[PDB]
């Protein structure tokens, strides 16, 4: 509250560790169903279904252009890319699979890098 105030956590190497994590979610081998925006004039169904669109590509230039306020803001996008796929895609279908295998990985990565 007013003059009273938890103890400083340093958040000044967080920009260039969530690029770190980014750049290893883009190079993983099954980051390709996520690498660019999903075409909304190719894929039927697409537009009217995911009201919040997100991809990597997204992902890396919001953050080098500063609309990430904080790593929070950061994750929840992430996760919408996941959170997407899943919406969309069956279980058990390459991009389904792909889905689940990089949200562990990245969710290994943000616990070890931050908790």
Same mark, same amino acid.
């Given at each position: 509250? /007013?003059?009273?105030?938890?103890?400083? %956590?340093?958040?000044?190497?967080?920009? *260039?560790?969530?690029? /770190?994590?980014? !750049?290893?979610?883009?190079?993983?081998?099954? *980051?390709?169903?996520?690498?660019?925006? +999903? #075409?909304? =004039?190719? +894929?039927?169904?697409?537009?009217?279904?995911?009201?919040?669109? /997100?991809?990597?590509? !997204?992902? %890396?230039? =919001?953050?080098?252009?500063?609309?990430?306020? #904080?790593?929070?803001?950061? *994750?929840?996008?992430? %996760?919408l890319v996941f959170d &997407?796929?899943?919406?969309? &895609?069956?279980?058990?279908?390459?991009?389904?699979? *792909?889905?689940? #295998?990089? %949200?562990?990985?990245?969710? =290994?990565?943000? !616990?070890? !890098?931050? =908790?």
């Amino acid at each position: 509250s /007013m003059s009273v105030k938890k103890p400083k %956590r340093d958040d000044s190497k967080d920009l *260039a560790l969530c690029s /770190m994590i980014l !750049t290893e979610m883009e190079t993983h081998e099954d *980051a390709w169903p996520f690498l660019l925006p +999903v #075409n909304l =004039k190719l +894929v039927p169904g697409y537009k009217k279904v995911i009201k919040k669109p /997100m991809d990597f590509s !997204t992902i %890396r230039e =919001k953050l080098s252009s500063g609309q990430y306020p #904080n790593l929070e803001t950061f *994750a929840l996008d992430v %996760r919408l890319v996941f959170d &997407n796929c899943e919406t969309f &895609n069956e279980d058990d279908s390459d991009i389904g699979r *792909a889905g689940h #295998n990089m %949200r562990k990985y990245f969710e =290994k990565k943000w !616990t070890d !890098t931050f =908790k």
